[PDB]
Amino acid sequence: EVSCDFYAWASDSIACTTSGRATSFGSLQCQVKVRSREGDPLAVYLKKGQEFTITGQKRFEQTGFQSALSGMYSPVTFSASGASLAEVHLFCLLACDHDSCCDG
């Protein structure tokens, strides 16, 4: 029988680890945590970011603006094969939610 347990942001379950070493990294992997029993019948379906308007613990919105005139700090540039668009988006989301000085 299908038993679907939904997890949420702010659970701090999601985490990301970067690979390699402004601060141009080389690869990224995403790790999520389930209260599951390490049993075989289970599948995990992660929301791809950059496809939903409002995502994140702080409910960031895809404003649709492609630029700002001031405010960037600590830029990071992952290299292609190594991270995916969703993976990079997940990385920045987790980062900005743990900063208290980040507005977007």
Alpha helical stretches, state H, 45-103: 85-97
The structure tokens 């942001």 sit at 9
Phi, psi of 19 (to 5 degrees): -130, 125
Phi-psi region of 7 (alpha: psi -120 to 50; beta: other; left: phi over 0): beta
Report whether 76 contacts 25 (CB < 8 A).
yes
Task: Provide the token pair at 45.
Answer: 């379906």
Resolution in A: 2.6
CA distance 102 to 96: 6
